[PDB]
Design a protein around this nucleic acid. Structure first.
Lengths: 66, 125, 223, 86, 180, 155, 186
RNA sequence: AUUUCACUCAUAUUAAAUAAAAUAACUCCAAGUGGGCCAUUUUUGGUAAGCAGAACUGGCGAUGAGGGAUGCUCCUAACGC
RNA sequence: CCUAUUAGCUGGUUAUUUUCGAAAGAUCUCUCAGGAUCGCUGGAGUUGAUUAAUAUAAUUUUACCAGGUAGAGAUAAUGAU
RNA sequence: AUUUUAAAAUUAUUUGAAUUUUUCUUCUUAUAAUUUAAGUUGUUUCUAUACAGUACUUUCUUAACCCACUCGUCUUGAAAC
């Protein structure tokens, strides 16, 4: 026969049963498709920082281990 | 009603009977939780066969002791009485139902000389 | 180890005389406050230059209805006012936020100005305290100043003497006194209500709303 | 520790004095104040009344100002109604 | 004092003003005097009338003093004046009023029972206005002139009401209705 | 039966009385930065980059900036949980929000007030007051000033 | 009646008691429960909590990863509440003193031959009651294959979950919904 | 834009109030359910319906107790002895 | 005899106490007496908190937004009259 | 059986102190007690000077006051004509 076509009854009671869950709000977000040609240069920037540190640590280790 | 003797308090006597066991003779009086749908006892209607619950639980300081003020221990033969030499005031003796006449006699004598009471001391004689 | 008992013995007299001097200052402050309010009120009478008090900065709220059939935000305001049972009472600091949130549960409560004798009676004969560690409080009647000092003594409010003096005059510490107190579990009124259904301010007999000063008789009749 | 009886912190004198170290002093001060003899309250009441004569006169002033205000509010209400009568 | 006979009204007068704003630097102070069941009920009624007659409510109204001003002599005999306005099930109507009791406090209450009994007007539907004093020869009511008559008497058509202690169930013989 | 992208937006997306016409020229001079709170309000004069049905009047942070577009991080409530949604709109439909303008001038207050007070070694609180009761003071009212007001009958 | 969450009973989650009936493990749990209760240190509390954890939360720790973790303090005690396994990828190991529940016998032999020593938790309690100079470590808790099937269901967008398949060939769940050519992808 | 160094913005009542706020968050496995109905307020069709169809909240269902004589849904109030 | 064929349908489905405790929405479906999938629920476990504080909140306050329902109007436009 | 202790109060002192101005004025220097501390103890009878009754415990049977509709099931809703 005829069916209950629709109702929103009890729905937000169910929603508030486990509360209205909020987004996790992580510190970092992926840059997968965000402003290319800008984050490429940020990759270059970071590499420019790591480059000197690697060799500096290697020299320190060699000089301290003799 | 709560029966109170000494420090022993029993919150309820006249143990719970199964619903409709009075008017149906295939229904034994042993208690059964009625599942049902509209049962009048599961729903806790007035004046109809109230159900047992944890609230009736006896005080655990005096939970298992008889009007003896002692816990009963059922013994089957001599030398099974041995642990009671150290608890002659906290425990009483009940002889197992299927113990013969002079086996009963020789552990009744041991219990008496051991100073521990016997519940069914006048059995089979 | 023998030094431990005597060094813990002398500190008792040390703190005893510390609070003995402090209570002399307390009573001097109390009588000075009593003298100041009456003298300002009296000065208000000579010339047409008036004096008063504002809202008493603190209100006592009694829940009137049960737990069934309540709107969700009424229930939430009840929860964060710590008014959970049909005869619970709490002290509420009076400001715009608390007054607005109380206006939404207005038809389900009755509140008013506590006054010193009534707050003292409430703390002395109905005062229970949350003793345990954080979120493990284990409701306990006061019966002593030890736990009050343990939770508030490092915050220099050790004592029910100090704690009535903090609840009545809404002093610098309510977060640690009102929250420290368990919600008062009050008896029904000795002579009964008029009508929980209707407001205290209606011409017809009723109960709910702001009784202001008229809550003292209700409290000591429910106490 | 074991829960004992919660002694009445108002009527149990020892418990109440333990909770409030100043209570015994306050109560004794009030008790002797009541213990002040009947002659002391009999002899000074007229002096205290003649010392409050000025205060009750000022209250007469304060309340008679209100009475004049109500009277003149009545007067202006009647004047406005009589003006609007026709 | 008989609590069964008593009403529960005393005098109030609480002084304040509308809230001073930057827009209106010095709003004028104002005043109004009524009685009701208690002081908080009187304040609520005063603020209701403030909202209905002017534009100010609790949210934009404050005060600066409060006092209780009892009457000159409580146990006098008085003749004061008010007026009534009430709405029925189908309209609104008005009149004046003056009833005789000892003083102002109970002067209001005798009219509420009268209105409830005659027109079934609940107290929420009644407004009383302008407490003042009235003369004695100016009454235009069929009853109140002989209240201050030089000399007046009526009999005691009283039907007895006795204490519950002596209101015994079984009587020896039938009581009479003359007394005195 | 009808759930198109612009359904039910007869008045929400309509232009206000006297407010028709394209966006003003100097609206394209907003300094938007990443992580900036922004209000997303539809400007129906611009059809491309138009915000969708539900985000008109919402607020969110900038997570992406392009040559003329802006990615706004808007939380939307969905049944039992709120989730973040990345809405990409044109700059005509985005407007710098005034939510953090309440905080920013207070943070400006700090560097000039707390900095001096701390070195002066005065303990002064900085939290907002949320004013309640009205403190006791002394007042002066003249006896001429007290005028009255009184009730009214039915007409 | 009173309006409280779950009628006012605080609910805790996770293990309450040790499930294993291994008497040696029960003795260890009793010892470290006593140590955690009497000694205030969080070290003993953490060890006592970890001793009753399930098997999947006492994951193995390889010799190479253990040495890498202990590289920056060579004189400290490496304590794990899992089992130590050997890493064939590690060419050489040196001077590691490790307390653990179990050592695979090859890893044990390698540790002894390297000059270090293996300790049990009773030894650790006996000669380091408060965990002084002891660094506690744990192996990868969710590196096992079971978590590769967890999270968002395989079929949700950007889902890394492994499906449950009979085989991993070309003919097994690779056509429709997993490549753009057949309807959609992922 | 990122990074590293400096200085430092109540933190000894807490960058507004209140909060038996960690009884939280997350993960895994899985049950039952997926015919609903009623009350206040709003509302569509209908002359109307204890009619048909929707919105909010609360209930009945799944629930007894005191009251409304009586009553699945009203009022009070939810339940260990 | 295959065959104890199949049945989205009807009926039945066996000890106690304790603890937690629903849904009758939604999407798709030769779907409308069914099913799958979310949602609601139990159990298990870890990370946390246990530090009257942070995370947090069917709450309020302060600041700032967005709306075209009630109302109002035919003088402001259309449609009337 | 290594807090029914510390304090608190009270009594009898005592030392010094103070102030309300003192037979319940207040605080330790010291002593000895006591409970108002630090959840009920005491006295007298009776059972009773018996070994099971007319008493006490308990089971059962009858009343009496108040209450109480056949369960199981499908169902929104079953005591259901």
């Amino acid at each position: 026969a005829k069916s209950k076509n629709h109702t929103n009854h009890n729905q937000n009671r169910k929603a508030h049963k486990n509360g209205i869950k909020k987004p996790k709000k992580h510190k970092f977000m992926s840059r997968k498709g965000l402003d290319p040609n800008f984050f490429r240069n940020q990759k270059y920037c970071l590499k420019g920082i790591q480059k000197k540190k690697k060799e500096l640590k290697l020299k320190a280790k060699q000089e301290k281990n003799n | 009603a709560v029966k109170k003797v000494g420090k022993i308090i029993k919150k309820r006597t006249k143990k719970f009977t199964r619903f409709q066991s009075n008017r149906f003779m295939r229904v034994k009086p042993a208690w059964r939780k009625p599942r049902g749908i509209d049962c009048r006892v599961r729903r806790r209607y007035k004046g109809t066969n109230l159900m047992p619950s944890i609230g009736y639980g006896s005080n655990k300081k005096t939970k298992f002791l008889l009007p003896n003020n002692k816990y009963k221990y059922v013994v089957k033969n001599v030398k099974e009485m041995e642990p009671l030499i150290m608890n002659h005031t906290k425990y009483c003796v009940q002889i197992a139902h299927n113990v013969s006449s002079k086996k009963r006699k020789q552990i009744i004598e041991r219990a008496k000389q051991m100073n521990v009471s016997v519940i069914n001391a006048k059995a089979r004689l | 180890a023998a030094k431990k008992i005597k060094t813990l013995k002398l500190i008792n007299k040390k703190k005893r005389n510390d609070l003995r001097q402090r209570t002399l200052r307390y009573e001097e402050e109390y009588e000075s406050e009593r003298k100041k309010i009456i003298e300002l009120k009296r000065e208000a009478r000579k010339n047409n230059c008036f004096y008063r008090e504002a809202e008493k900065k603190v209100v006592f709220v009694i829940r009137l209805k049960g737990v069934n059939k309540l709107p969700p935000k009424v229930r939430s305001v009840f929860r964060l006012l710590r008014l959970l049972q049909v005869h619970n009472g709490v002290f509420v600091k009076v400001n715009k936020a608390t007054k607005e949130m109380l206006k939404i549960v207005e038809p389900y409560v009755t509140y008013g100005y506590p006054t010193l004798s009534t707050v003292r009676k409430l703390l002395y004969k109905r005062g229970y305290v949350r003793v345990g560690k954080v979120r493990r409080y284990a409701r306990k009647k006061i019966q002593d100043n030890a736990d009050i000092s343990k939770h508030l003594g490092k915050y220099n409010v050790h004592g029910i003497e100090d704690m009535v003096y903090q609840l009545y005059t809404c002093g610098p510490v309510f977060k640690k006194v009102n929250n420290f107190l368990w919600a008062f579990k009050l008896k029904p009124p000795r002579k009964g209500f008029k009508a929980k259904r209707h407001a205290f301010n209606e011409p017809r007999p009723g109960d709910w709303g702001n009784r202001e000063a008229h809550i003292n008789e209700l409290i000591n009749r429910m106490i | 520790k074991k829960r004992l009886q919660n002694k009445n912190s108002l009527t149990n004198f020892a418990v109440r004095c333990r909770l409030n170290p100043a209570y015994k002093l306050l109560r004794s001060l009030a008790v002797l104040r009541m213990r002040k003899s009947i002659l002391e309250k009999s002899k000074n009441k007229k002096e205290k009344r003649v010392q409050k004569q000025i205060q009750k006169k000022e209250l007469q002033k304060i309340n008679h100002d209100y009475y004049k205000g109500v009277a003149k509010a009545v007067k202006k209400k009647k004047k406005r109604e009589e003006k609007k009568a026709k | 004092i008989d609590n069964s006979l008593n009403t529960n009204i005393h005098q109030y007068h609480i002084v304040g003003r509308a809230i001073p704003t930057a827009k209106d630097k010095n709003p004028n102070v104002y005043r109004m005097c009524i009685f009701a069941k208690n002081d908080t009920n009187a304040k609520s009624r005063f603020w209701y009338f403030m909202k209905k007659i002017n534009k100010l409510k609790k949210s934009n109204g404050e005060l600066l003093a409060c006092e209780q001003i009892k009457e000159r002599f409580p146990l006098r005999v008085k003749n004061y004046g008010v007026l009534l306005r009430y709405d029925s099930r189908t309209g609104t109507h008005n009149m004046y009023k003056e009833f005789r009791d000892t003083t102002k406090e109970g002067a209001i209450a005798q009219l509420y029972s009268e209105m409830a009994g005659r027109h079934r007007a609940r107290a929420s539907s009644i407004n009383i206005i302008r407490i003042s004093e009235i003369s004695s020869s100016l009454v235009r009511r069929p009853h109140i002139k002989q209240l201050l008559k030089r000399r007046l008497r009526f009999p005691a058509l009283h039907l007895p009401t006795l204490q519950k202690e002596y209101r015994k169930k079984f009587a020896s013989k039938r009581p009479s209705t003359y007394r005195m | 039966k009808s759930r198109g992208k612009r359904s039910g937006t007869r008045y929400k997306f309509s232009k206000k009385f006297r407010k028709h016409g394209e966006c003003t020229a100097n609206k394209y001079l907003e300094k938007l930065n990443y992580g900036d709170y922004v209000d997303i309000v539809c400007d129906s004069t611009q059809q491309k980059g138009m915000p969708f049905n539900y985000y008109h009047g919402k607020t969110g942070k900038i997570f992406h900036i392009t040559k003329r577009g802006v990615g706004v991080l808007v939380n939307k409530r969905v049944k039992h949980r709120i989730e973040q949604k990345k809405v990409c709109v044109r700059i005509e439909h985005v407007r710098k929000s005034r939510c953090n303008e309440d905080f920013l001038l207070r943070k400006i207050k700090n560097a000039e007030l707390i900095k001096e007070a701390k070195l002066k070694n005065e303990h002064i609180n900085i939290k907002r007051k949320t004013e309640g009761p009205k403190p006791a003071a002394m007042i002066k009212v003249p006896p001429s000033k007290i005028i009255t007001i009184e009730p009214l009958p039915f007409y | 009646g009173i309006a409280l969450k779950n009628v006012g009973r605080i609910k805790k989650h996770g293990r309450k008691h040790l499930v294993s009936k291994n008497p040696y493990l029960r003795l260890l749990v009793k010892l470290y429960n006593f140590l955690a209760r009497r000694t205030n240190a969080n070290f003993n509390k953490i060890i006592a909590k970890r001793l009753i954890m399930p098997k999947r939360y006492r994951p193995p720790l390889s010799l190479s990863k253990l040495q890498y973790h202990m590289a920056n303090h060579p004189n400290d005690i490496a304590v794990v509440v899992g089992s130590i396994t050997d890493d064939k990828r590690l060419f050489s190991l040196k001077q590691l003193k490790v307390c653990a529940l179990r050592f695979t016998e090859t890893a044990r032999k390698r540790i002894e031959d390297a000059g270090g020593e293996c300790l049990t938790f009773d030894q650790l309690a006996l000669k380091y009651p408060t965990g002084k100079k002891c660094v506690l470590l744990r192996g990868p808790t969710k590196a096992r294959t079971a978590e590769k099937h967890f999270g968002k269901a395989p079929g949700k967008p950007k889902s890394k979950a492994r499906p449950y398949v009979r085989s991993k060939g070309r003919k097994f769940e690779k056509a429709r919904g997993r490549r753009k050519s057949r309807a959609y992808k992922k």
